[PDB]
């Protein structure tokens, strides 16, 4: 942004804006588990399949 009002219109002093930047990497996140194909079918109680 712009700085304070100075105290001299005689011999005015120029200024510049500062360009700021922020860099961030969006790396992935994961998590998983292994299960057997027969066991999910060989489970009549409803558990092992709410996975």
């Amino acid at each position: 942004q712009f700085p304070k009002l100075r105290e001299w219109i005689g011999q005015r002093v120029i200024k510049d804006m500062a360009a700021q930047g922020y860099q961030i990497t969006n790396k992935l996140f994961e998590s998983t588990v292994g299960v057997k194909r027969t066991d999910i079918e060989d489970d009549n109680l409803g558990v092992y399949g709410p996975l």
Binding site: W8, I9, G10, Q11, R12
Partner: protein, 44 residues
Amino acid sequence: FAPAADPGAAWYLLDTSRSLKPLIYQERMKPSFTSMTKEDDEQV
């Protein structure tokens, strides 16, 4: 000092003037100027 004996009735006179440009009034009072910006609003 600086005498000058001259005629004033002949077809031509001495020390003729050349009114090429009449009095022209030029003003520089608009903002965003050099003397009004760099310096303290100095008009001319």
